[PDB]
Design an enzyme around this catalytic site. Structure first.
Site, short mmCIF file in Angstrom:
data_model
loop_
_atom_site.label_atom_id
_atom_site.label_comp_id
_atom_site.label_asym_id
_atom_site.label_seq_id
_atom_site.Cartn_x
_atom_site.Cartn_y
_atom_site.Cartn_z
N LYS A 163 0.86 -0.93 0.02
CA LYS A 163 -0.04 -0.10 0.43
C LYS A 163 0.93 1.49 0.16
O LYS A 163 0.65 2.42 -0.32
CB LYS A 163 -0.63 0.19 1.39
CG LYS A 163 -1.99 -0.86 1.28
CD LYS A 163 -3.23 -0.78 0.06
CE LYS A 163 -4.60 -1.49 0.32
NZ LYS A 163 -4.12 -2.79 -0.16
N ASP A 239 -9.77 -1.30 -3.42
CA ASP A 239 -9.80 -1.92 -1.32
C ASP A 239 -9.48 -0.18 -1.29
O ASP A 239 -8.02 0.47 -1.72
CB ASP A 239 -9.63 -2.57 -1.22
CG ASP A 239 -7.66 -2.48 -1.39
OD1 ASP A 239 -7.08 -2.01 -2.70
OD2 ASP A 239 -7.53 -2.64 -0.61
N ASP A 240 -10.09 -0.10 0.25
CA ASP A 240 -9.79 0.87 0.88
C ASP A 240 -9.60 2.43 0.55
O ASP A 240 -8.42 3.17 -0.12
CB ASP A 240 -8.60 0.83 1.65
CG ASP A 240 -8.68 0.26 2.46
OD1 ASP A 240 -9.48 -0.75 2.77
OD2 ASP A 240 -8.19 -0.59 3.03
N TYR A 279 -14.96 -5.42 -0.66
CA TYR A 279 -13.57 -6.41 -0.95
C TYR A 279 -14.55 -7.48 0.39
O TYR A 279 -13.48 -9.39 0.64
CB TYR A 279 -12.40 -6.39 -0.20
CG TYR A 279 -12.00 -5.43 0.14
CD1 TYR A 279 -12.11 -6.04 1.97
CD2 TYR A 279 -11.68 -4.25 0.50
CE1 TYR A 279 -11.93 -5.11 2.52
CE2 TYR A 279 -11.98 -3.63 1.46
CZ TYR A 279 -11.21 -4.27 2.71
OH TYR A 279 -10.74 -2.68 3.25
N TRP A 334 -8.27 -12.94 -0.95
CA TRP A 334 -7.47 -13.21 0.05
C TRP A 334 -7.39 -12.91 1.41
O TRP A 334 -8.45 -12.21 2.41
CB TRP A 334 -7.62 -11.22 -0.55
CG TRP A 334 -6.83 -9.62 0.52
CD1 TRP A 334 -6.32 -9.69 1.73
CD2 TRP A 334 -6.05 -8.94 -0.09
NE1 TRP A 334 -5.17 -8.69 1.65
CE2 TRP A 334 -5.56 -8.45 0.72
CE3 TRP A 334 -6.23 -8.26 -1.71
CZ2 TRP A 334 -5.20 -6.71 0.66
CZ3 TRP A 334 -5.37 -7.42 -1.63
CH2 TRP A 334 -5.15 -6.60 -1.18
N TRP A 335 -6.35 -13.23 2.48
CA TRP A 335 -6.90 -13.76 3.37
C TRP A 335 -5.84 -12.89 4.53
O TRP A 335 -4.25 -13.33 3.87
CB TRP A 335 -6.06 -15.40 4.02
CG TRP A 335 -6.45 -15.57 5.66
CD1 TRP A 335 -8.16 -15.52 6.25
CD2 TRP A 335 -6.07 -16.49 6.12
NE1 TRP A 335 -7.68 -16.00 7.77
CE2 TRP A 335 -6.68 -16.28 7.48
CE3 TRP A 335 -4.41 -17.23 6.85
CZ2 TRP A 335 -5.59 -17.47 8.71
CZ3 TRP A 335 -4.39 -18.06 7.47
CH2 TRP A 335 -4.49 -17.83 8.30
N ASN A 336 -6.35 -12.57 5.48
CA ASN A 336 -6.09 -11.54 6.29
C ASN A 336 -5.47 -11.62 7.70
O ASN A 336 -5.76 -11.27 8.63
CB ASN A 336 -6.51 -9.71 6.70
CG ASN A 336 -6.93 -9.14 5.13
OD1 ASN A 336 -5.48 -8.27 4.74
ND2 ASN A 336 -7.54 -8.50 4.70
N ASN A 369 -2.24 -11.96 3.65
CA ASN A 369 -1.81 -11.09 3.54
C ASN A 369 -1.03 -10.70 5.13
O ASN A 369 -1.13 -10.98 5.90
CB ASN A 369 -2.57 -9.71 3.31
CG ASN A 369 -2.47 -8.05 3.62
OD1 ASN A 369 -1.50 -7.88 3.04
ND2 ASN A 369 -2.66 -7.96 3.93
C1 LIG Z 1 -8.24 -6.32 0.48
C2 LIG Z 1 -7.84 -5.51 2.11
O1 LIG Z 1 -7.11 -6.39 2.85
N1 LIG Z 1 -7.08 -4.25 2.00
C3 LIG Z 1 -7.17 -4.05 3.51
C4 LIG Z 1 -5.40 -4.24 3.65
O2 LIG Z 1 -4.40 -3.68 1.77
C5 LIG Z 1 -4.83 -3.85 5.05
O3 LIG Z 1 -3.40 -4.68 5.01
C6 LIG Z 1 -5.99 -5.12 5.34
C7 LIG Z 1 -5.58 -6.23 6.49
O4 LIG Z 1 -4.70 -5.33 8.00
C8 LIG Z 1 -7.01 -4.61 5.64
C9 LIG Z 1 -8.03 -3.83 4.07
N2 LIG Z 1 -7.71 -2.76 4.65
#
Ligand SMILES: CC(=O)N[C@@H]1[C@@H](O)[C@H](O)C(CO)=C[C@H]1N
EC number: 3.2.1.169
Length: 590
Positions: A163, A239-240, A279, A334-336, A369
């Site tokens: 980002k 995203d965001d 998302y 996309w697993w955070n 991620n």
């Molecule tokens: C698609 C997506 O998950 N975008 C952002 C990501 O960049 C950010 O790391 C995180 C995880 O903290 C969540 C979202 N705000």
């Protein structure tokens, strides 16, 4: 162990010796990446024309003609066999052959191989890592190390999207990388290719994109620049963001244009992927048209990403069904986790769990991620590689242990000790939590329960706490000094100092419980205050980022227990000796 575990394995309880003398059959026609691995394993061992046969090749190659029925008819699939007579390493495709070699490398145990027959392939088509967090982007060296780790663990996907890369996000998404970074990206692509990894370059243009020709062409021109650097897979992230960039019809039209003018025009482009503005389910409007517009309008070959029911969540059957219905294709997950960019003072070193293991057919892809801490993230990345390749056989704890032992074989038990108490995220705006310190949690609960109501504790519990603090100190000091993975130690070092101090405070507080006399207790009390001030100094000097600065460790069970026990025995002392000692648990200079 084999990681990931293969789809089918038959073990014969014989073992053989790696030849010794060998004939290599198909080394000229097989995947060069696979042949390179094979030749490194066979280093200084003589090829001839008699002696043990080793056949390597892809389905269709002369060398593996005899084995064509055993080669799984799956993308990235392979047949491996080891017996007395011969060794067979046969991919359904070039990448399959490389994967056979990665399994073969793990079977070989100091010159010996087990006698095995393996038929293997992935359950999920795209498996890997999105570097897609906020925070300091991974170093060049880290990324080079990641790419080799992915190949070893059969992850075929690296999505580049930090980002805070100015050439990824706004406004300099329009600008080509300067020369130095461009050359680095070129080298990453080359290395990705060597390790059978798709380097996917993502762009994040939506905050200030204008839906006009100027910005369209700028985007396609940037994609062209990346192509020239060797990039063959591409993503557009929405995203965001807020504003007109959130327009789903326009996003869909942009992606289809990229597809039609670029993805379907070049001789050799692979993935085209997009991340939606909606998302996850909680960020979606079930009464809006956003996701149905994407689902209807996006060209069927384009992938659509998804983080689950919430920004941070584990993937369920019901959750993936909900999105799949709207986007009209299997979601590309996309697993955070282990991303820590919202809990930056914590390391998240615990097991990978929570994701349904029966939904492989319902996803196009699964990427993790990770944390800004690249080496630390390998615990989770290794586990995601295992989960996404063979979800049905996915074993949370075994894979965590295998991950740790692979990353730091010289001090695996110490790293286990550190990681087990550095798992949870603490309270956060995302409501996401992990277990931590599970083994000692009942002993802790019983010890502390005995204090708040009456008394008294079991000796074996006091002793378990004592054993834990001791083990935490051995682990901290050995890790600090470990030179096998220096990049990893550099990453965790601030937390390792804080972890040692936590353990010492624990030991001192337990001496206060045992309080033999007034002056001994005061010596312990004064030591604890000094340890609290030392923890405070680390919390204010290390990891001083704008968002969650500092260094928290063993926060779920251990630190609460120490702090509560301290407050309790100080309370008791103050009653018993009519004293007025400060019972507060965090050092505050002001
Ligand atoms: C698609 C997506 O998950 N975008 C952002 C990501 O960049 C950010 O790391 C995180 C995880 O903290 C969540 C979202 N705000």
């Amino acid at each position: 162990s084999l990681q990931p575990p293969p789809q089918q394995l038959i073990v014969q309880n014989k073992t053989i010796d790696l030849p010794a003398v060998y004939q290599l059959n198909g080394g000229e026609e097989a995947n060069p990446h696979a042949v390179k691995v094979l030749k490194e394993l066979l280093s200084g061992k003589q090829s001839s024309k008699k002696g043990m046969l080793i056949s390597i090749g892809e389905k269709g190659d002369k060398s593996v003609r005899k084995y064509s029925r055993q080669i799984p008819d799956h993308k990235e699939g392979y047949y491996l066999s080891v017996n007395e007579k011969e060794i067979v390493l046969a991919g359904n495709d070039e990448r399959g052959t490389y994967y056979a070699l990665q399994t073969f490398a793990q079977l070989l145990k100091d010159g010996k191989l087990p006698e095995v027959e393996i038929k293997d392939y992935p359950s999920v088509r795209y498996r890997g890592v999105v570097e897609g967090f906020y925070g300091t982007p991974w170093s060049h060296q880290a990324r080079l190390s990641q790419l080799k780790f992915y190949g070893k663990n059969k992850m075929n996907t690296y999505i580049y999207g930090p980002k805070d890369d100015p050439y990824h996000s706004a406004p300099n998404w329009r600008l080509p990388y300067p020369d130095k970074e461009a050359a680095q990206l070129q080298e990453l692509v080359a290395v990705a290719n060597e390790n059978e990894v798709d380097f996917v370059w993502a762009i994040h243009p939506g905050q200030d994109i204008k839906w006009n020709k100027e910005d369209r062409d700028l985007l396609l021109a940037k994609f062209e620049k990346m192509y020239q650097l060797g990039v063959r897979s591409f993503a557009v992230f929405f995203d965001d963001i807020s504003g007109e960039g959130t327009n789903p019809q326009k996003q869909a039209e942009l992606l289809n244009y990229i597809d039609e003018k670029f993805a379907q025009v070049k001789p050799d482009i692979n993935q085209l992927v997009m991340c939606p503005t909606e998302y996850n389910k909680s960020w979606s409007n079930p009464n809006g048209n956003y996701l149905t517009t994407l689902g209807d309008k996006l060209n069927p070959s384009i992938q659509i990403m998804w983080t689950g029911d919430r920004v941070i969540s584990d993937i369920t059957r019901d959750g993936i069904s909900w999105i799949n219905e709207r986007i009209k294709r299997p979601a590309y997950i996309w697993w955070n986790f282990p991303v820590s960019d919202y809990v930056r003072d914590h390391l998240l070193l615990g097991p990978v769990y929570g994701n349904d293991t029966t939904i492989a057919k319902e996803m196009s892809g699964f990427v993790t991620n990770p944390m800004e801490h690249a080496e630390s993230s390998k615990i989770a990345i290794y586990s995601v590689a295992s989960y996404a390749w063979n979800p049905a056989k996915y074993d949370t704890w075994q894979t965590w242990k295998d991950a740790i032992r692979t990353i730091l074989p010289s001090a695996a038990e110490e790293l286990e000790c550190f990681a087990m108490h550095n798992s949870d995220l603490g309270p956060n705006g995302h409501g996401y939590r992990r277990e931590e310190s599970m083994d000692i949690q009942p002993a802790a609960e019983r010890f502390l329960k005995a204090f708040k109501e009456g008394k008294n504790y079991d000796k074996a519990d006091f002793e378990t706490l004592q054993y834990t603090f001791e083990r935490m100190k051995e682990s901290a000091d050995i890790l600090l000094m470990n030179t096998e993975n220096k990049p990893l130690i550099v990453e965790i070092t601030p937390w390792v100092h804080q972890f040692k101090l936590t353990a010492e405070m624990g030991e001192e507080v337990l001496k206060m419980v045992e309080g033999r006399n007034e002056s001994y207790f005061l010596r312990k009390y004064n030591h604890v205050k000094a340890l609290q001030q030392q923890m405070f100094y680390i919390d204010q000097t290390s990891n001083q980022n704008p968002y969650q600065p500092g260094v928290k460790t063993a926060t779920r069970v251990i630190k609460p227990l120490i702090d509560r026990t301290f407050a309790t025995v100080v309370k008791f002392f103050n009653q018993k000796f009519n004293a007025h000692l400060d019972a507060t648990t965090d050092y505050m200079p002001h």
